[PDB]
Structure formats: structure tokens, C-alpha cells
Amino acid sequence: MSHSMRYFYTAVSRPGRGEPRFIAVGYVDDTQFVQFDSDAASPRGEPRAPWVEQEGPEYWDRETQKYKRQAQTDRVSLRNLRGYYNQSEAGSHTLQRMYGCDLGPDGRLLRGYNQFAYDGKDYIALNEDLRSWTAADTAAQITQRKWEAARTAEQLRAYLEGTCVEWLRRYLENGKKTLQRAEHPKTHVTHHPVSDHEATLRCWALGFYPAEITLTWQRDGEDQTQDTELVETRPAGDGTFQKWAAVVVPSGEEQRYTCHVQHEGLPEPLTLRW
């Protein structure tokens, strides 16, 4: 199947409290492999996976150098954005970026992406063609005009279609046991009386990878999607994920409920019972 490499950058100004902080994290699929934090005791690219730990000091020094250069640059961008929106000098602001690439069963590029947000809102995005922009507002149209003049999309497209994919391929080789295997969820069903006529059934999925999963309660074979409490999928801290789904049922009807679990690591979807 297919894989992705994605970088997530956050820069946060804090006028009067030093210069803006810059924090980056990188992932292959759902696995973090790197982080950089400008406020770290020693600000350096940090390995987060065994399969980049064996990259030697040159690789790490070069990553570190590029992160510092990016951080400074993002500080200029925050300055520029403050100006575009006529915002005061004193307020704190956030710039986010996500970019990356996906490759398919043959190791070839599928797609690339690069999006920016300012203060938690869509700002400007590279379109799917990697040649054109979508600006969310008037200020972002300035950045669009600027990047069109500068042919910024050409630089970004060259990296996303080329070097991004080369890195992703290399990481997939080095971390194959980790990266190219799914881990099925470990499931169980619990039950809690709620009142003299209702009870909760909770369907658990633990230990699964990748994060994508569907948990659905059914009654008599039919979806009760509208009546379920579903928690957000959450990291277990060991590189795997967890989720649960709960439904409140008439006491005595439990035997008619089944939980349906769909996950890549399952050869067939599971049907579970209390």
C-alpha cells in the first residue's frame, strides 16, 4: 500500500518575551521520527524513531542547520503578517505550516501538499497541482502576489515531487519492520448500569496501528451511529493508538447489540458482543 512523510511547523510570537518560538515535528505515516524546538535546552533536530537514529552526525547537523534557518525565516513571516493585518506590536500570533508527500505501492509519488494557517485559520494553500495558490483572505492575496512574482511554487513543487519522495523512500527502507506493518486492535466490551432501565455498552480498541479505525455499534445488524459516544482516537504513548465507542441501551436489550471494528490490520472486520 502507500505511505506519507509530513512535517508540521508552528511559530509563535511573544512580544516583550523574546523572539518567536519555532517547533517542528516530522512523521512517516502515523510514526513521529523527528522534532526540533527553538526553546529546547540545546535546539537541535532530535531523533524520535530508531530508523533515523542510525543516520550519522552529518545528517543531523544538516537537519539542525535547516531548522534554525527555517525558524528565523518564520520569525520574518510573523513580522510581515502582523503588518498585513495592521495588528499591534504587542499581541501574540501563530503561524502554522504542514507539508509533505505520499507515495504508492510502486514507490512513486502520488501527491504533495503545503498549507499555511495564521492564528488558527486557513491562510494560503498550495493547490493540488503544486503550481497555484488559494488565498483565504485579502492579506493572503498579498502573499499570493508575492509568491507568484517569485515563482515560489516551483521551489516547493521540486522538493515535494523529488527530494521529499527520496527521503520517504529511504526512511521506509530503514524502518520497514516498524513502518510497513499494521497492528490489529485488541478489543473488549464493557458494561455499566446507568439506571433502572438503561446501561452503557463500551467497545474498546487498543494497541492498533495505523491510527485510522472505525468502531460502530449496531442493533439487530443496523447502525446506531447517531446514538454513540465516540472518543477521539488517542496515542497510547508506545507508537500505537486507542479508541472507544459507547452506546446507551435499554436494559435487557444488550444481546441485540454488536460492535463492528474495521482496521487495516484485520483480515476481516470484527463483530463483538458483550
Partner: peptide, 9 residues
């Protein structure tokens, strides 16, 4: 490996 080309908004 991160993008080495930088640019400002």
C-alpha cells in the same frame, strides 16, 4: 529531511 529553500509570507 526538511525543505532547505526558505521564503517568507
Amino acid at each position: 529531511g526538511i525543505l532547505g529553500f526558505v521564503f517568507t509570507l
